[PDB]
Design a protein around this ligand. Structure first.
Ligand SMILES: CC(=O)N1CCN(C(=O)[C@H](Cc2cccc(C(=N)N)c2)NS(=O)(=O)c2ccc3ccccc3c2)CC1
Ligand SMILES: [Ca+2]
Length: 223
């Protein structure tokens, strides 16, 4: 997260860290046994880390559970990043409490202007590489589809939305991928892509979760 702030230990209880000997992506706990992330984060040998703040120290409240299966959306395109969504089933159910809780799926799409909270352990520098120990947060509004498409001509599909600041300096970045974009207590987006990080007139593009609610539910019901 570039231009964000330290969230505070366990203030984003649904935030998940995808680990394979190091943190590579974020995710969101949608129920005791299912995590939603980005398809481009797919990797074998995934350990899901719940209740995390400092990802390098065992401080208490953590829960490490192996992923039993990772379901990448069947129509995911690695070139366009369209349908950039993946579901992860936990080997065991997570112990829900005050510091580990699930986030609600949207019942409707969010409109332009809505302020959302984006979080993660990704890169914090626009020009360079710096990874934090603790979780960073960023509040950013959803932009208009016209603006989004003016920024990324021919690359924005109906399953994506832009969020952030056109002036630059505040945006999600590498390592944040798969993480949550929560608006009004509902998971509206998943950190997907963007041209660089925090660049002028290049906001972040996120997977439009409201278009996948039925898919998620059906897929979960059948697995
Ligand atoms: C591995 C992976 O899928 N990806 C896709 C997602 N990737 C990126 O978007 C990267 C870094 C990144 C990651 C997450 C959010 C942002 C943001 N600006 N909000 C930027 N930005 S980039 O300019 O290097 C970039 C942009 C679009 C891309 C589209 C396809 C492939 C690579 C791409 C790289 C990481 C590699
Ligand atoms: Ca820790």
């Amino acid at each position: 997260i570039v231009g964000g702030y330290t969230c505070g230990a366990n203030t984003v209880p649904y935030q998940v860290s995808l680990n394979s000997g190091y943190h590579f992506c974020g995710g969101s706990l949608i129920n005791s046994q299912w995590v939603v992330s980005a398809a481009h984060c797919y990797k074998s040998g995934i350990q899901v880390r719940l209740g995390e703040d400092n990802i390098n120290v065992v401080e208490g409240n953590e829960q490490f559970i192996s992923a039993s299966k990772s379901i990448v959306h069947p129509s995911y395109n690695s070139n366009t990043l369209n349908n950039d969504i993946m579901l992860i089933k936990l080997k065991s159910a997570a112990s829900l409490n005050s510091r580990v809780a699930s986030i609600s799926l949207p019942t409707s799409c969010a409109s332009a202007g809505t302020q959302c909270l984006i979080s993660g352990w990704g890169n914090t520098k626009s020009s360079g590489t710096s990874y934090p120990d603790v979780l960073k947060c960023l509040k950013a509004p959803i932009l208009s589809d016209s603006s989004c498409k003016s920024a990324y001509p021919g690359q924005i599909t109906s399953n994506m939305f832009c969020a952030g600041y056109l002036e630059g300096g505040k945006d999600s970045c590498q390592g944040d991928s798969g993480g949550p974009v929560v608006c009004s207590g509902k998971l509206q987006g998943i950190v997907s892509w963007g041209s660089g990080c925090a660049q002028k007139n290049k906001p972040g593009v996120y997977t439009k979760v409201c278009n996948y609610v039925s898919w998620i539910k059906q897929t979960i019901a059948s697995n």
